[PDB]
Amino acid sequence: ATLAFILYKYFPFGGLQRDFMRIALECQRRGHDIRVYTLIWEGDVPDGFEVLVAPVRSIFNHRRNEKFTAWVRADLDRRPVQRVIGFNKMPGLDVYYAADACFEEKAQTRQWGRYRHFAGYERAVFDPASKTEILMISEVQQPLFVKHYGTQAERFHLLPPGISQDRRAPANAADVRAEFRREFGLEEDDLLLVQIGSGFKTKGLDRSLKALSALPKALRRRTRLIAIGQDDPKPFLLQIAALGLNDQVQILKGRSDIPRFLLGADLLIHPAYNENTGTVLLEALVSGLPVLVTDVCGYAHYIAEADAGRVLPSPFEQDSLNRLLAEMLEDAPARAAWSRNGLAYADHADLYSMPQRAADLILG
Amino acid sequence: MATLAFILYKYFPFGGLQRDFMRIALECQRRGHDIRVYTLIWEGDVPDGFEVLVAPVRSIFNHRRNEKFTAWVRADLDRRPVQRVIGFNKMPGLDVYYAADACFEEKAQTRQWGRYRHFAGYERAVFDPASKTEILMISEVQQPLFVKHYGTQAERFHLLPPGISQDRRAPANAADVRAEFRREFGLEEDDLLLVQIGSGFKTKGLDRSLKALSALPKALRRRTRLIAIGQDDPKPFLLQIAALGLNDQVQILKGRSDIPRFLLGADLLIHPAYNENTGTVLLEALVSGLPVLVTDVCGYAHYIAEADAGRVLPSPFEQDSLNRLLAEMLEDAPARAAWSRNGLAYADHADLYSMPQRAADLILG
Ligand SMILES: CC(=O)N[C@H]1[C@@H](OP(=O)(O)OP(=O)(O)OC[C@H]2O[C@@H](n3ccc(=O)[nH]c3=O)[C@H](O)[C@@H]2O)O[C@H](CO)[C@H](O)[C@@H]1O
Ligand SMILES: O=c1ccn([C@@H]2O[C@H](COP(=O)(O)OP(=O)(O)O)[C@@H](O)[C@H]2O)c(=O)[nH]1
């Protein structure tokens, strides 16, 4: 009856990790024991989950991961399960949840060990002779996987989103908003930008900050940014110092009260360099928080489609971002429309049901 | 605060009160309200975002445990305020009461005992003209009994339509679910399955059903079996089954979640209750096209009459009239096919589903 779930890292504050957790909980609800193999588990263990932290070690993450596989398989050979579900690419998965973009594609934007390892493990899932079922959440990547490996179409299953319910604006949103802004010292005429999620460099924190720096006087004195993620802030503190933004930027470690931030803020800014999907984009949306996002993000189309913010087309130019941010912030009418647009869309679209649909496919 | 407090003595997945509560609560949640629950026990899964508080109060007498419960709850509430308080049992401090029970005071004629005084006192707590509790009704029949005993103001009552879940309706593959089920339990084409569904076997008349299975003509009795489904102890009934010789044709099962399989696999729902506020499973049979044999005391029995989806036995109850009726309904396969068809058609035209949305509408203003 047991399901073995594999991922390299569990922590509470990542997209891959919250997806794994919500799927796993649902399979358990459905009457399954839950085994989990991992290199690290931070935060609570739900009741009934057997969590196996692997004792393997290397000065190279790529080799560490190869050892991890052999370790896992050695345990699984001795203790069989019904099905093996992996959230990272490696051999021996029955199902793969594609929480990462296509590696081989990204590479081309040879001889090195890291390249051959990560490409080797991708092919391990996506090769035509592999029997791994693939759970897709970014539509855009499927054709890239097929271009590079020729994976069969029958093997792919596109899931809708799995935003948790707590992210949806509550009936007392105005009260949550006022309490939050009272707490952080934000007045009616202050503007809060929030940049949410770990991976500050990849999600374009540097771009956000330049764009804050380049706002016209009247908007600049009114604007502050809070970034929320596990990353080392120190590489950005130097940027923040250079640009004179000490008094109007803060960077916080990961935390579980993201919905309060979503309600208290005036804009989600997310000018990612690259992103498989971007759960927070939609989390902003169901909170009624306008989004500024680049078009490379897999979930960007939802912002354009619900008219709940602006999507900045490629190629990225700092100058365009600057302009777009200033214009979204000058336009209080536009912002009100995008909040209401987001909330209404949240009431239509299936943005929630990914875990049940993911459970269906794993279980049959 | 947007929190709604929901109060019920017992949550478990396999009761009418409990399922109505779950569905109202999920609807209110989906409209942006966090859900807190006060209860003496909670069995089964806990939906995402639901704060369940299991009260630590204890007494030898249920009625006194209940009074300690109320005090425990009010203490939590006064320290942690909510938007609105909705109860599924009658007690003080309710903004809203959902009447999953019949009128007690009326049933107490069917003075000094502490049990009586408590339940009467908690019912008056809701229904008195000075209480402000709004009442959500599901059995229309009880509203005048309440006004008779308490003088409750008309405007405080709001009659809701039924709240049958979508999954009880015969689906597209009904015949395949039916055939699969009857294969599993070993039922041939000429076998006839009576089902009796709900915890509370005594009140729901399992003794009467059993007598009636026993009194069938040899030829039918040979072909007929009964499955009862609920949480009760089977022990008292296993003496009756034996004493009537019914060992090899009666099974009693614990609460389960696959009730629709049974409704599709059965040949008759039998439900000769002594009393019953409404009776959800009566409409579940109906929307599965399972014909029903029901006493007229059940508040949903009329739906069986109005839809011609089975027969209703008039009060006063007489065992031998039940016997006659069961025999008649089983003997007549064309009438049973007609009651089935009648059930499915009535389900396609009637408002049997929208209770949770209407209840939420009244709770939220
Ligand atoms: C005796 C009595 O006064 N009962 C009341 C109580 O329902 P009861 O639980 O007494 O009976 P009911 O037939 O109204 O409700 C049973 C419900 O539980 C379900 N079920 C039952 C058995 C099982 O194994 N699995 C399962 O899911 C069944 O399919 C239905 O959805 O509350 C109802 C709704 O609030 C009405 O007020 C009923 O009149
Ligand atoms: O401090 C934090 C940062 C992020 N998150 C959640 O982590 C997920 C991040 O997923 P996303 O797709 O935005 O980014 P990824 O981590 O996959 O790059 C979302 O549910 C965020 O709300 C969180 O709970 N706390």
PDB file of N, CA and C in Angstrom, chain A residues 22 25 28-30 164-165 168-173 175 347, chain B residues 1-3 26 29-34 45-48 83:
ATOM      1  N   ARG A  22       1.249  18.428  -0.458  1.00  0.00           N
ATOM      2  CA  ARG A  22      -0.186  18.450  -0.667  1.00  0.00           C
ATOM      3  C   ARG A  22      -0.632  17.190  -1.416  1.00  0.00           C
ATOM      4  N   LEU A  25      -0.172  14.216   1.282  1.00  0.00           N
ATOM      5  CA  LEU A  25      -1.277  14.262   2.213  1.00  0.00           C
ATOM      6  C   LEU A  25      -2.529  13.673   1.569  1.00  0.00           C
ATOM      7  N   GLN A  28      -2.405   9.911   1.211  1.00  0.00           N
ATOM      8  CA  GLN A  28      -2.599   9.350   2.551  1.00  0.00           C
ATOM      9  C   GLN A  28      -4.076   9.393   2.942  1.00  0.00           C
ATOM     10  N   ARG A  29      -4.723  10.541   2.715  1.00  0.00           N
ATOM     11  CA  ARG A  29      -6.152  10.653   2.913  1.00  0.00           C
ATOM     12  C   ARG A  29      -6.836   9.479   2.227  1.00  0.00           C
ATOM     13  N   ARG A  30      -6.277   9.043   1.089  1.00  0.00           N
ATOM     14  CA  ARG A  30      -6.961   8.068   0.257  1.00  0.00           C
ATOM     15  C   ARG A  30      -6.629   6.653   0.706  1.00  0.00           C
ATOM     16  N   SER A 164      -3.156  26.839  -2.472  1.00  0.00           N
ATOM     17  CA  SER A 164      -3.930  26.439  -1.313  1.00  0.00           C
ATOM     18  C   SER A 164      -4.981  27.526  -1.002  1.00  0.00           C
ATOM     19  N   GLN A 165      -6.095  27.068  -0.415  1.00  0.00           N
ATOM     20  CA  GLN A 165      -7.279  27.857  -0.079  1.00  0.00           C
ATOM     21  C   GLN A 165      -6.982  29.055   0.822  1.00  0.00           C
ATOM     22  N   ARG A 168      -6.579  32.556  -0.640  1.00  0.00           N
ATOM     23  CA  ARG A 168      -7.714  33.269  -1.198  1.00  0.00           C
ATOM     24  C   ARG A 168      -8.114  34.393  -0.254  1.00  0.00           C
ATOM     25  N   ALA A 169      -8.389  35.583  -0.810  1.00  0.00           N
ATOM     26  CA  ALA A 169      -8.848  36.707  -0.002  1.00  0.00           C
ATOM     27  C   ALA A 169      -9.986  36.237   0.902  1.00  0.00           C
ATOM     28  N   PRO A 170      -9.866  36.455   2.232  1.00  0.00           N
ATOM     29  CA  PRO A 170     -10.975  36.190   3.158  1.00  0.00           C
ATOM     30  C   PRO A 170     -12.009  37.323   3.161  1.00  0.00           C
ATOM     31  N   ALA A 171     -13.184  37.053   3.740  1.00  0.00           N
ATOM     32  CA  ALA A 171     -14.254  38.044   3.870  1.00  0.00           C
ATOM     33  C   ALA A 171     -13.801  39.287   4.651  1.00  0.00           C
ATOM     34  N   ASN A 172     -12.778  39.173   5.490  1.00  0.00           N
ATOM     35  CA  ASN A 172     -12.308  40.289   6.296  1.00  0.00           C
ATOM     36  C   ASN A 172     -11.006  40.861   5.711  1.00  0.00           C
ATOM     37  N   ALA A 173     -10.784  40.726   4.402  1.00  0.00           N
ATOM     38  CA  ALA A 173      -9.502  41.097   3.810  1.00  0.00           C
ATOM     39  C   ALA A 173      -9.061  42.498   4.250  1.00  0.00           C
ATOM     40  N   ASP A 175      -9.593  44.071   6.944  1.00  0.00           N
ATOM     41  CA  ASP A 175      -9.176  44.098   8.332  1.00  0.00           C
ATOM     42  C   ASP A 175      -7.792  43.480   8.428  1.00  0.00           C
ATOM     43  N   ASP A 347     -12.697  33.228  -8.736  1.00  0.00           N
ATOM     44  CA  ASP A 347     -14.011  32.662  -8.463  1.00  0.00           C
ATOM     45  C   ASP A 347     -14.450  31.761  -9.621  1.00  0.00           C
TER      46      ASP A 347
ATOM     47  N   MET B   1     -13.026  40.042  12.506  1.00  0.00           N
ATOM     48  CA  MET B   1     -12.731  38.603  12.252  1.00  0.00           C
ATOM     49  C   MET B   1     -13.828  38.031  11.347  1.00  0.00           C
ATOM     50  N   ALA B   2     -13.426  37.049  10.523  1.00  0.00           N
ATOM     51  CA  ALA B   2     -14.283  36.384   9.559  1.00  0.00           C
ATOM     52  C   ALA B   2     -14.575  34.950  10.020  1.00  0.00           C
ATOM     53  N   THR B   3     -14.026  34.555  11.173  1.00  0.00           N
ATOM     54  CA  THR B   3     -14.212  33.212  11.687  1.00  0.00           C
ATOM     55  C   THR B   3     -15.697  32.965  11.955  1.00  0.00           C
ATOM     56  N   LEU B  26     -17.942  23.921   4.573  1.00  0.00           N
ATOM     57  CA  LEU B  26     -17.139  24.038   3.366  1.00  0.00           C
ATOM     58  C   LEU B  26     -17.639  25.180   2.477  1.00  0.00           C
ATOM     59  N   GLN B  29     -16.588  28.406   4.091  1.00  0.00           N
ATOM     60  CA  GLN B  29     -15.145  28.494   3.935  1.00  0.00           C
ATOM     61  C   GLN B  29     -14.777  29.031   2.558  1.00  0.00           C
ATOM     62  N   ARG B  30     -15.471  28.530   1.537  1.00  0.00           N
ATOM     63  CA  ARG B  30     -15.145  28.849   0.160  1.00  0.00           C
ATOM     64  C   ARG B  30     -15.502  30.304  -0.136  1.00  0.00           C
ATOM     65  N   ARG B  31     -16.393  30.895   0.666  1.00  0.00           N
ATOM     66  CA  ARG B  31     -16.725  32.307   0.529  1.00  0.00           C
ATOM     67  C   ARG B  31     -15.831  33.207   1.397  1.00  0.00           C
ATOM     68  N   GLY B  32     -14.711  32.688   1.929  1.00  0.00           N
ATOM     69  CA  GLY B  32     -13.682  33.492   2.587  1.00  0.00           C
ATOM     70  C   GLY B  32     -13.712  33.478   4.133  1.00  0.00           C
ATOM     71  N   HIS B  33     -14.279  32.423   4.754  1.00  0.00           N
ATOM     72  CA  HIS B  33     -14.361  32.357   6.217  1.00  0.00           C
ATOM     73  C   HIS B  33     -13.533  31.188   6.750  1.00  0.00           C
ATOM     74  N   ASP B  34     -12.681  31.460   7.757  1.00  0.00           N
ATOM     75  CA  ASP B  34     -11.982  30.405   8.474  1.00  0.00           C
ATOM     76  C   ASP B  34     -12.982  29.696   9.399  1.00  0.00           C
ATOM     77  N   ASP B  45     -11.501  12.375   8.759  1.00  0.00           N
ATOM     78  CA  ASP B  45     -10.482  13.324   8.328  1.00  0.00           C
ATOM     79  C   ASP B  45     -10.908  14.756   8.666  1.00  0.00           C
ATOM     80  N   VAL B  46      -9.900  15.607   8.845  1.00  0.00           N
ATOM     81  CA  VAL B  46     -10.085  16.996   9.192  1.00  0.00           C
ATOM     82  C   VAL B  46      -9.750  17.821   7.960  1.00  0.00           C
ATOM     83  N   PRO B  47     -10.761  18.457   7.346  1.00  0.00           N
ATOM     84  CA  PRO B  47     -10.555  19.218   6.113  1.00  0.00           C
ATOM     85  C   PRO B  47      -9.561  20.360   6.328  1.00  0.00           C
ATOM     86  N   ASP B  48      -8.833  20.727   5.265  1.00  0.00           N
ATOM     87  CA  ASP B  48      -7.838  21.789   5.320  1.00  0.00           C
ATOM     88  C   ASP B  48      -8.463  23.071   5.881  1.00  0.00           C
ATOM     89  N   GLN B  83     -17.108  35.872  14.096  1.00  0.00           N
ATOM     90  CA  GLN B  83     -18.117  36.631  13.359  1.00  0.00           C
ATOM     91  C   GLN B  83     -19.514  36.113  13.717  1.00  0.00           C
TER      92      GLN B  83
END
